């Protein structure tokens, strides 16, 4: 009784007229399926394939998003943490100044925090502004008899902009601290952006191919069994593992997906390990008090040579915890694409009393074919589909173009060089 399909099709929601009791005899399904049912069942067959794959790898999209939101929130907090800590130490020792000149540190980090969150891309002039704002106020402390009305309404570019080769008031501290601050803001940024792509990459990469060549005769896999015979013959592994590979042999991100998690860990280690953050959290205060000491004993040369013109939330999780917590989440992601076919053929299919044989392309006959191929050279011997001459598809092949430059952008940033 083909009406066994009728109730099963009623669960899927078909208008059960002209399908219950009648069977007659770039295409599909060589049957108790009507003409318009076929054209509408392949569309129904494709739907689960998308929803199954996207839900299968859905946790990579959520993990990279969760680590992003918790790493991005971490860096912003430690910027605000160090801003408040630098004010405490400098107010204790010196009761002569800084009593009402802590307003510069607010404008210092705020422009630093714009380089981190891409709000701006100007840091070399940003630091020169800060050193100048300190330069035009410490300078008169050892020159108290003199008073200075600045030139025009702005002293200069930013008073002694050091351009054109001024004998630096703070000798080497501006260059040294710039090198230490620059390597930090760019390393913590290429890491966050790298995670930001990873979410976007896998999110759109999970949107599954339409591949009409794969879609047509995909119905043969699981759909057309319902059309002719009873639906109790859920397909076994042999047939399944090749149609899901042949339809997905394009998205072979495996060569470019491995180096990505490598660069994520490599940059994380240099960033987790000191010299990239917690050192430059206190290095600012050390070099500032060191540069002023150079000034104190080298002001005789510079001041004499400058007679001319004007002269509540939960505290940031420890980065070490945030790194091995990051490391564990990523361990289950490296060999993900190779293990993707097993999960897809390991859900609705009970392959894991009745029998072992299952449905095949043209009957219930026994199957013993091969089923490992995963790239164009490997899937050129495709028994059940027609993979493209070069496996990678036109939009995907553009996900190994702008979505692996971050790896080199994270690797180079881990060295100190950027752009």
């Amino acid at each position, epitope marked *: 009784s083909c009406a066994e399909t009728r109730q099963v099709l009623g669960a899927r929601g078909y208008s059960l007229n002209l399908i219950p009791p009648a069977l007659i005899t770039l295409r599909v399904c060589p049957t108790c399926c009507s003409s318009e049912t076929e054209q509408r069942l392949i569309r129904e067959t494709e739907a689960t394939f998308r929803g199954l794959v996207e839900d299968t790898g859905s946790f990579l999209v959520h993990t990279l998003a969760a680590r992003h939101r918790k790493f991005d*929130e971490f860096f912003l907090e430690m910027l605000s943490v160090a801003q408040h800590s630098l004010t405490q130490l400098f107010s204790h020792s010196y009761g002569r100044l800084y009593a009402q000149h802590a307003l510069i540190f607010n404008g210092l980090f705020s422009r630093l925090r714009d380089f981190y969150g891409e709000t701006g891309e100007g840091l070399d002039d940003t630091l020169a502004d800060f050193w100048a704002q300190l330069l035009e106020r410490v300078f008169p402390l050892l020159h108290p008899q003199y008073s200075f009305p600045p030139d025009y309404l702005l002293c200069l570019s930013r008073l002694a902009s050091s351009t054109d080769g001024s004998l630096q008031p703070f000798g080497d501290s501006p260059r040294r601290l710039r090198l230490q601050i620059t390597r930090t803001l760019v390393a913590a940024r290429a890491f966050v952006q790298g995670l930001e792509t990873g979410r976007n990459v896998v999110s759109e990469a999970l949107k599954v191919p339409v591949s009409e060549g794969c879609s047509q005769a995909l119905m043969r896999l699981i759909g057309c069994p319902l059309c002719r015979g009873v639906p109790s013959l859920m397909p076994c592994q042999g047939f399944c593992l090749n149609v899901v590979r042949g339809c997905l042999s394009s998205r072979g991100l495996e060569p470019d997906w491995g180096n990505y998690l490598d660069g994520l860990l490599i940059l994380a280690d240099k960033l987790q390990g000191p010299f990239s953050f917690e050192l430059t959290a206190e290095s600012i205060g050390v070099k500032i008090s060191e540069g002023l000491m150079y000034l104190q004993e080298n002001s005789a040369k510079v001041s004499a040579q400058v007679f001319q013109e004007c002269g509540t939330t939960a505290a940031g999780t420890n980065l070490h915890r945030l790194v091995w917590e990051l490391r*564990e989440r990523l361990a289950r992601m490296r060999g993900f694409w190779a293990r993707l076919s097993l999960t897809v053929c390991g859900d609705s299919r009970m392959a894991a009393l009745e029998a072992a044989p299952c449905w095949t392309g043209a009957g219930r006959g026994r199957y013993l074919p091969p089923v490992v191929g995963g790239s164009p050279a490997e899937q050129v011997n495709n028994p059940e589909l027609k993979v493209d001459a070069s496996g990678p598809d036109v939009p995907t092949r553009r996900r190994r173009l702008q979505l692996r430059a971050a790896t080199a952008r994270m690797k180079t940033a881990a060295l100190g060089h950027d752009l």
Partner: antibody
Amino acid sequence: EVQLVETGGGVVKPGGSLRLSCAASGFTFSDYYMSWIRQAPGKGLEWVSYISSSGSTIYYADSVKGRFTISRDNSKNTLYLQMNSLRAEDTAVYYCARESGYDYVFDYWGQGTLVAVSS
Amino acid sequence: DIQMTQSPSTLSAFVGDRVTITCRASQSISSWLAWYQQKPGKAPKLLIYAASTLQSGVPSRFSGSGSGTEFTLTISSLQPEDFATYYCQQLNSYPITFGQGTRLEIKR
């Protein structure tokens, strides 16, 4: 489809030991983070433990730090929980859940099986 | 060591009304907040995670918007199968804490 079935007795006196199994099917057990959340006869839900997918990181609540132990079996696809020397306060309905990927969200919960401590 | 709160404890509303459930936390939580629905004596469902994002299968009538220490959960048009107990969660600290449920009953 995605199924989390729990088993284990629930009627023991103070000092008795119970172990619960959270048999999982419908998805690869090795990818996701698992956890245990209990619901007392009261309204609120209390968190007790959680374990990494590989099993490398284990967390216990402050009220279950010494006498509680959680394990894992990615081959059999089963989540366990060792309940030892439970006090009367441990009386609750114990669920097992799966972390969808985002930190501490539980999209799929178990049917529930209750543990009772009484003399 | 972290406290979660909800309001109100019990809200009476008709089928087809607009319902807003407010959750309040002790300390700041940027976007780490989850919502759950629990019918009597059965397993809870995941409604809204990450403050504002909906879970697959949850209808469009469920909405949640919050940033900081004040959060809400909105039902645009109440359908008869929405009468249950709704729970708040935390996704930041090591001791994750739920808020006591808000019971949504039928008005009569």
